Amino acid sequence: STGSATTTPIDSLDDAYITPVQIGTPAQTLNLDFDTGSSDLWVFSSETTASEVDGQTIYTPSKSTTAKLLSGATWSISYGDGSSSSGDVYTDTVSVGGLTVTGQAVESAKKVSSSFTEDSTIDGLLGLAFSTLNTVSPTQQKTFFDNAKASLDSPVFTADLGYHAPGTYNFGFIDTTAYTGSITYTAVSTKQGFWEWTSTGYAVGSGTFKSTSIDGIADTGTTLLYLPATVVSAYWAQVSGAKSSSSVGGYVFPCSATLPSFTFGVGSARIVIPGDYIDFGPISTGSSSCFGGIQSSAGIGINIFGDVALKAAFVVFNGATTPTLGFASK
């Protein structure tokens, strides 16, 4: 089997991407944030505290003839941005782009933190990291990809995120028309539960490539590119007037600037992020200070190849017995 679904930016900045997902019988379609940095499929629901729902579409398990309470199971998750959610668990039929999994754990939110409530466009998350990170207790549950894997034509999914435009998540096949050149594959460590890999270096604009190992995670659920402070300083030093602002929470730059590109290495291959992809717009409405799309990971503990980086590539998440990542230009 295969599946193919369009993913759409939630706003004009590509702050996140939503993909329609069918849950239950008859189908209830919710727009989920596919997140290769986490491993829970959770949804706003008829169980979510009413004051914490503000415009999201909810899953109502009592209206699904295939929903079953997973008795005793609870979940609770905290994300790197400080947001969180928790609740109980149903199993139900879940379909993405024509690919169907029966018995998928659908984690129903009883509580969500303010940033989820405040984002009416995201109805929940669909985790695509390794199932070892799934938070369901006392019986850990598998991701949608893990459940589908054995049925897929090939044990892979691909992320093809657009810049200010829709893109595609495919399951079970590699669309050879969706990228240019060849796909360069690179090793993955699953030791932390992430799609963790080592970039071979970087360049800023037309500058020379610096060969240096940068361990980080391919994370579709993180908006920006978070790299070591040395790398980030080297980038922003090429932008007149750019500075790190403690009060804003990162590097800002004059909105009048033209940003240089940023290149990262995948083995001997190179992925080029155009400068425009690094502009996240005014820090507040009407400001002439703009927020940068490349930020320091120093306070995180891990480097994160988020959407800013991934949207410049066609990315293969290869879930073979030994997982690997593939990157192609497009």
Swiss-Prot record:
Residues 17-328 form the Peptidase A1 domain. It is an enzyme of class 3 (hydrolase). Keywords: Aspartyl protease, Disulfide bond, Hydrolase, Protease, Signal, Zymogen. Its EC number is 3.4.23.22. Disulfide bonds join C255-C290. It comes from the Eukaryota. The active site is at D35, S199. It catalyses: Hydrolysis of proteins with specificity similar to that of pepsin A, prefers hydrophobic residues at P1 and P1', but does not cleave 14-Ala-|-Leu-15 in the B chain of insulin or Z-Glu-Tyr. Clots milk. GO terms for biological process: proteolysis. One of its GO terms (molecular function) is aspartic-type endopeptidase activity. The keyword Protease applies. Belongs to the peptidase A1 family. This is Endothiapepsin. It comes from Cryphonectria parasitica (Chestnut blight fungus). The gene is EAPA.
